[PDB]
C-alpha cells in the first residue's frame, strides 16, 4: 500500500515496570537488563506495516517517578494513544495503572485509545497480579489489554500493532 499514517503514543506507569525496555524491544529490538530510570521523557520513533498502511509512531517514553507526574500532561495531551504499563509481579505497580487510566480517561483527548501492559510476563513464577482480573478490569474500562515481556520481546510489536490497527 501507498498510505502513510503517524500518530502519537505515550507511555505511563509506576517507576521500574518495564516501559522504557518495552519501548527500546519495539523500537530497537534491544532489551537491557540494567536500564536506568528515566529522566522526565525520552522519545522515540518506530515505522511499521500495517494492511496496506505505512504507519509512524511517534512515541513518548516518560519517566515514572512520582515527582514527574505533574509534567505528565505535556506528553499525553496530545497523543492518539497511551500504554499504562504495569508489573505483573506487582500489585501496587497495577493500582497505580489504573490511576493512570483514570487521568488519562479524564484528561486526555475524549477519544484517545487506551492499552494496558501487564509487563514482565516471564516473571510469571512470581505473579501478583492475576490474568483474567486485568482482563476483566480492562474490558470494563475498554482499554486494549496484554501481558507482555520486554524481555522475551512476547506480545510487544503485537500490543503497538493492536494499537494501530485500532486507530
Ligand atoms: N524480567 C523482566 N525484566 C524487565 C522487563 N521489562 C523491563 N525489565 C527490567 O525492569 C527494570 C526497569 O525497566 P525500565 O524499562 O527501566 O523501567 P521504566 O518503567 O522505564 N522505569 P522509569 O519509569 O523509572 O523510567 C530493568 O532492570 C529492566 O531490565 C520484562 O519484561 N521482564
Ligand atoms: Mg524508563
Redesign the pocket.
Known sequence: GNKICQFKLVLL??????????VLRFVKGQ????????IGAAFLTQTVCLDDTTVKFEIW?????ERYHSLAPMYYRGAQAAIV?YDITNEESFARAKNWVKELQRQASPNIVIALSG?????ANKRAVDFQEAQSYADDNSLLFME?????SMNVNEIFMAIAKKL
Open positions: 506507569g509506576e517507576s521500574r515496570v518495564g516501559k522504557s525496555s518495552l532489551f537491557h537488563e540494567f536500564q536506568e530510570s528515566t517514553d516518560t519517566a515514572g517517578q504499563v509487563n514482565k510476563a516471564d516473571l507482555t515481556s520486554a524481555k522475551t
